Write a protein that binds this ligand. Structure first.
Ligand SMILES: NC(=O)C1=CN([C@@H]2O[C@H](COP(=O)(O)OP(=O)(O)OC[C@H]3O[C@@H](n4cnc5c(N)ncnc54)[C@H](OP(=O)(O)O)[C@@H]3O)[C@@H](O)[C@H]2O)C=CC1
Ligand SMILES: NC(=O)C1=CN([C@@H]2O[C@H](COP(=O)(O)OP(=O)(O)OC[C@H]3O[C@@H](n4cnc5c(N)ncnc54)[C@H](OP(=O)(O)O)[C@@H]3O)[C@@H](O)[C@H]2O)C=CC1
Ligand SMILES: COc1cc(C[C@@H]2CO[C@@H](c3ccc(O)c(OC)c3)[C@@H]2CO)ccc1O
Ligand SMILES: COc1cc(C[C@@H]2CO[C@@H](c3ccc(O)c(OC)c3)[C@@H]2CO)ccc1O
Lengths: 286, 287
């Protein structure tokens, strides 16, 4: 009855939320348990905390091809959320899935900028498609913790107190999404017959905002005007890949420059998800 | 009387995060030290702000800014620190601040392990607390169950071994294994208990005083399988590196159990309503 899901990378930022979202959806949830690399107290405790919620642990190693095959044979769907070298370990996962033969869908570690735009992620896609593994690519949003809570400033995760850099004129549309919402959309789409072999864009409508609109949401919550320093494009390219990431998002507008139909956008596919709006998101910092 | 306001220092540490939640559970108005970011540290930031949803307040302060420590402690009645273990010695700056503010009714320094006065920068911190005249409680005497029980006291891992296990000496030295949650709850109960002002509190839940070989047997009965044991002489063990030695005092010298403690200084008796987790329940999560 339940879809059986294996979550790969279950102790990461996105992966842990995907574990929880799969359980909250009612999926029978399995989490890949990799051989310890270190005395890692919070890693181990996070993993075992999942059992208390009803998840099961499956031990396997990426260096052990047969242990991966044994793992994926126990589930119906695989979701990966590796850090993004670590993206490429999914190639081992693809061969294991291809050998196993029983996987109905694979969602690789995407959850960001679409890599098919004119990349290790694209190499994983090709292997998936070469093997004929049904897939769903979840893309198109900035994690609110990495880009909204710091008003998109680099090198920090919390609002600045007095000053703020604005990229260009800060009128390039961006997509700011609470990581919990991304995970819940992921749990809902992964067995949806409508999203088989599709790209799903996480673009909740009211969270499509320019940097300046984000800052102005904050300024209205606090009642304080920030001192703004506009940084021109070339002023931003003083760098001789993470500056590259910001440049594509805030200068090239790579998240919002192509329109998406309702049949491929998460908030339209799953309108019951009451996604967190950025004014609510930012309240925790007041 | 009223809440009793507590500032937790090291609030995103292993022990500190449990202490934050314990203080909220006990009904204290709970404040957490927000230190300036040293890096893009997503899980550290999310942990800190998760406390707000639970009713805690954050106070930004820096150890390198004496005036920010003063201001932070001036907003609370009690201070509890749980720094990793230099980390220890930064508490000296905190004592100077506590000294100047002059409103702190009690300070619990970062202890929660072997009593150093029976073996240290912890002792240095004690000396400063006492020289300054700051009322104190020292919480000592227990092995964290995550570091010593879930691995059956094996080094280099935190989960039960699959078939063989090392026995230190004869595995008949008494050790104290306690759930970190219980340590934190005892800490939140004791920090304003008049019976423990200016005392050492020993966390020694009676049913959790166990030999390594007893711990192993609890697990063998849970799994129904016996484990291949190999014993290891003190001298062998000591064949030449501070983690080792922590273990040696604990499992060879028996430093946690070689002295008696009285009920008016033992947490499980001071706080008998804390139904502490026994090791047979603790280990079940691993099955
Ligand atoms: N704004 C946005 O849209 C963002 C996009 N992303 C993307 O989301 C996806 C997940 O990112 P994130 O949550 O930050 O990932 P994490 O950095 O949190 O790592 C997650 C897990 O990946 C496993 N892992 C990492 N390296 C290796 C390795 N060499 N070998 C084996 N396993 C490894 C580990 O799994 P285990 O739990 O088993 O130990 C680790 O816990 C990525 O594709 C990333 O590009 C992430 C940041 C922001
Ligand atoms: N078996 C046992 O009984 C055990 C005993 N202990 C003892 O418990 C106490 C706390 O240990 P534990 O919870 O594991 O420690 P942690 O390593 O988990 O504590 C980390 C926190 O302490 C702060 N910290 C660390 N270094 C610094 C620094 N240079 N400057 C400022 N802050 C710093 C940070 O505070 P912030 O959150 O604000 O960023 C950090 O988050 C210690 O006294 C330890 O000796 C701990 C392990 C096992
Ligand atoms: C907030 O300050 C920073 C934030 C980051 C976040 C990095 C941002 O680019 C992020 C990212 C990676 C992959 C993506 O597909 C992605 O899509 C938005 C974003 C990185 C996530 O770790 C990097 C450097 C910083 O200084
Ligand atoms: C579980 O494997 C290890 C576990 C540790 C735990 C270290 C154990 O000695 C612990 C300790 C530190 C301070 C203490 O006061 C203490 O009292 C028991 C124990 C250390 C806590 O970080 C160290 C090395 C290991 O290989």
């Amino acid at each position: 009855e339940k879809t059986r899901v294996l979550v790969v990378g279950g102790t990461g930022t996105m992966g842990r939320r995907i574990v929880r979202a799969c359980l909250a959806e009612g999926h029978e949830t399995y989490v890949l348990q990799q051989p310890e690399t270190r005395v890692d107290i919070e890693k181990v405790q996070l993993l075992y905390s999942y059992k208390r919620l009803g998840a099961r642990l499956i031990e396997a190693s990426f260096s052990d091809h047969q242990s991966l095959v044994s793992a994926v044979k126990q589930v119906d769907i695989v979701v990966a959320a590796m850090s993004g070298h670590s993206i490429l370990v999914q190639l081992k996962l693809v061969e294991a899935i291809k050998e196993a033969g029983n996987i109905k869908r694979f969602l690789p570690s995407e959850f960001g900028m679409d890599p098919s735009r004119m990349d290790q992620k694209l190499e994983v896609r090709n292997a998936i498609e070469a093997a004929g593994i049904p897939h769903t690519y979840v893309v198109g949003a900035c994690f609110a913790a990495y880009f909204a809570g710091n008003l998109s400033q680099m090198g920090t995760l919390i609002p600045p107190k007095k000053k703020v850099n604005i990229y260009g004129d800060g009128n390039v549309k961006v997509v700011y999404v609470d990581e919990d919402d991304i995970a819940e959309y992921t749990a809902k789409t992964l067995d949806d017959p409508r999203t088989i072999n599709k790209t799903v864009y996480v673009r909740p409508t009211e969270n499509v905002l320019t940097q300046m609109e984000l800052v102005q949401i904050w300024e209205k919550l606090t009642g304080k005007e920030l001192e703004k320093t506009n940084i021109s494009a070339n002023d931003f390219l003083a760098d001789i890949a993470g500056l590259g990431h910001f440049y594509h998002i805030f200068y090239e507008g790579c998240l919002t420059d192509h329109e998406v139909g309702d049949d491929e956008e998460a908030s339209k596919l799953y309108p019951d998800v009451k996604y967190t709006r950025m004014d609510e998101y930012l309240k925790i910092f007041l």
